[PDB]
C-alpha cells in the first residue's frame, strides 16, 4: 500500500500526514499481511515506529505466517528497535511459521546486544522450532563463539537434539572450529549423544 513506501522509504512527515489524514492507515495492510510497523521496522526508521507505537499500534500483530516485528528487530540488527519493541511489550517467545524465536535470528546475525536485551527480558534460550533446533546449532555452525558464551551467561543448554539428532557440538565440529569444539567440550557438552547417522562429535571432527 501507500504506507509501505512511506514506511520503507522513510517519509516521516508524509507518513505522519497520512496518519493524521486517516487513522485507518495505521491498521491497514497489503497482501503481505503487514502494517506500516513491519515496513518501517524492516527499513530501520526509529522515529516512524515511535510515532506508530506512540499512537498504540498493536505490537503483537502477526502476518499470514505468524511473524512478529521482534524478529525484524533481531534479524535486522537494530538495537534501538529492540529497545522500542521490548519497551512496548513485544513477545519474546512469539511463534513464527516454523516455530522459531527472535533469539535464533539474533544469534544468526551475531548481534550480541540484541541477545542480551532479548534474553534479559525473559527469552527462552532452549526454545525449539519445528525442526527441534536452537540458536546454538546455527550460531555454533556459523562460527559465533561469543554468541555461544553469552548464551551460556543465560544458562543455555549445549545438548539439544536436532531433527537429525545432532547437537551444537556436532555443528561446531562440522565447521572445524577447534576453539568452539574444545571450549564446548570443556564446558560440559555431551560427546556421547549420537545422531541418526550414529556419529559422535569426535568422529565428525577431522
Amino acid at each position: 500500500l501507500m504506507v509501505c513506501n512511506l514506511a520503507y522509504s522513510g517519509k516521516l512527515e508524509e507518513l505522519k500526514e497520512s496518519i493524521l489524514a486517516d487513522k485507518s492507515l495505521a491498521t491497514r495492510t497489503d497482501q503481505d499481511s503487514r502494517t506500516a510497523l513491519h515496513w518501517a521496522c524492516s527499513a530501520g526508521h526509529t522515529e516512524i515506529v515511535e510515532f506508530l507505537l506512540q499512537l498504540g499500534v498493536p505490537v503483537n500483530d502477526k502476518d499470514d505466517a505468524g511473524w512478529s516485528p521482534l524478529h525484524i528487530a533481531a534479524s535486522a540488527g537494530r538495537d534501538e528497535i529492540v529497545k522500542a519493541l521490548l519497551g512496548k511489550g513485544a513477545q519474546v517467545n512469539a511463534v513464527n511459521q516454523n516455530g522459531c524465536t527472535p533469539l535464533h535470528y539474533a544469534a544468526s546475525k551475531n548481534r550480541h546486544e540484541i541477545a542480551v536485551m532479548l534474553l534479559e527480558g525473559g527469552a527462552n534460550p532452549d526454545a525449539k522450532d519445528h525442526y527441534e533446533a536452537t540458536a546454538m546449532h546455527r550460531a555454533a555452525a556459523k562460527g559465533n563463539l561469543k554468541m555461544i558464551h553469552i548464551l551460556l551467561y543465560y544458562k543455555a543448554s549445549t545438548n539439544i537434539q536436532d531433527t537429525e539428532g545432532n547437537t551444537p557440538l556436532h555443528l561446531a565440529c562440522d565447521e572445524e572450529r577447534v576453539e568452539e569444539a574444545k571450549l564446548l567440550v570443556s564446558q560440559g557438552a555431551s560427546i556421547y549423544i549420537e545422531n541418526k547417522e550414529e556419529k559422535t562429535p569426535l568422529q565428525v571432527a577431522k
Binding site: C4, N5, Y8, D30, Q31, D32, H38, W39, S42, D63, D64, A65, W67, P69, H71, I72, A74, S75, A76, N96, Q97, N98, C100, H104, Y105, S108, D129, H130, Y131, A133, R138, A141, K142, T163, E175
Partner: protein, 236 residues
C-alpha cells in the same frame, strides 16, 4: 565454499597462465571431474566459468561421436583438439561419459572396439597434451560405478570435485549473497530454508531467489518474503 573454490582454483587460475604455459612449457593436469547423482549441477559452474572468464567455449552435450562411421572418430576429436590447441584455449566440457565409457555388448561388432581403440589413441594424445598446448578438458558424470578407471587414472583426472547434495554452508552463503543486495526482512528465513532444501534436492537456489523476485516484482509486494520462497519451491 570449497566446491566453487575448487572450481575456480582448479579451472580459472591456471586458465590465464596458458599464454605463459606456452612459453615455460609446464602444464598442470587439466582433468576436472564432477559427480553427484542427487544434485543436478553441471550447469551453474559451466555458466559461471562461461561468464567470469573470457575464453573460447566448446560445450558438447553427451557423446556427439556415436556416429556409425568408425573412421569419423579421429576426425571429430582431432578437429576439436586442433581448434582447442590452435584456435584458442577452449574449455572442452564433456558431460555424461557413462554412455561411451562402458562397453555395451556384442564384442565382435568391431565398431565399438574400434572407437574405443580410438579412445585409447586420444588417450595417448591427452597423455601428450601435458606439454605446450592450450587444452582444457573438464569432465562431468553422475554414476562412477560403471566408469572404467582408464580415464580416471591418476595423472589424467586429478580434480575429483564431489557434490552429492548442496551442503548447508553453500545454502546459507547463497541466500546471504542474494538477500544482501535485495530487500531483507524477518520472513526471509535461513533455518527451515537450510534444513528443508537439505532434504529435498534443489538446484539453482540463487535463480530460485531471482524467480521469487520475479513473483514479488508485481509492484504490490516490496520486500521478498517466505510466501514467494515456498511458492517458488512448490512451483519451480
Amino acid at each position: 565454499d570449497i566446491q566453487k573454490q575448487e572450481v575456480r582454483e582448479a579451472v580459472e587460475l591456471p586458465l590465464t597462465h596458458f599464454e605463459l604455459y606456452k612459453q615455460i612449457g609446464i602444464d598442470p593436469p587439466r582433468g576436472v571431474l564432477m559427480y553427484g547423482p542427487p544434485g543436478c549441477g553441471k550447469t551453474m559452474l559451466a555458466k559461471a566459468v562461461a561468464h567470469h572468464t573470457t575464453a573460447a567455449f566448446i560445450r558438447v552435450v553427451g557423446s556427439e561421436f556415436v556416429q556409425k562411421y568408425l573412421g569419423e572418430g579421429p576426425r571429430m576429436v582431432r578437429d576439436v583438439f586442433r581448434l582447442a590447441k590452435e584456435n584458442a584455449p577452449a574449455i572442452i566440457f564433456i558431460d555424461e561419459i557413462d554412455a561411451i565409457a562402458t562397453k555395451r555388448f556384442d564384442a565382435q561388432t568391431g565398431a565399438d572396439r574400434e572407437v574405443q581403440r580410438i579412445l585409447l589413441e586420444l588417450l595417448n594424445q591427452m597423455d601428450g597434451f601435458d606439454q605446450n598446448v592450450n587444452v582444457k578438458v573438464i569432465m562431468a558424470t553422475n554414476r562412477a560405478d560403471t566408469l572404467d578407471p582408464a580415464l580416471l587414472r591418476p595423472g589424467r583426472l586429478d580434480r575429483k570435485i564431489e557434490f552429492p547434495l548442496p551442503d548447508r554452508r553453500q545454502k546459507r552463503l547463497i541466500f546471504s549473497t542474494i538477500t544482501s543486495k535485495m530487500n531483507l526482512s524477518e520472513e526471509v528465513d535461513l533455518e527451515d530454508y537450510v534444513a528443508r532444501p537439505d532434504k529435498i534436492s534443489g538446484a539453482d537456489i540463487n535463480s530460485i531467489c531471482q524467480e521469487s523476485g520475479m513473483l514479488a516484482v508485481r509492484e504490490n509486494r516490496y520486500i521478498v518474503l517466505a510466501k514467494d520462497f515456498e511458492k517458488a519451491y512448490k512451483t519451480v
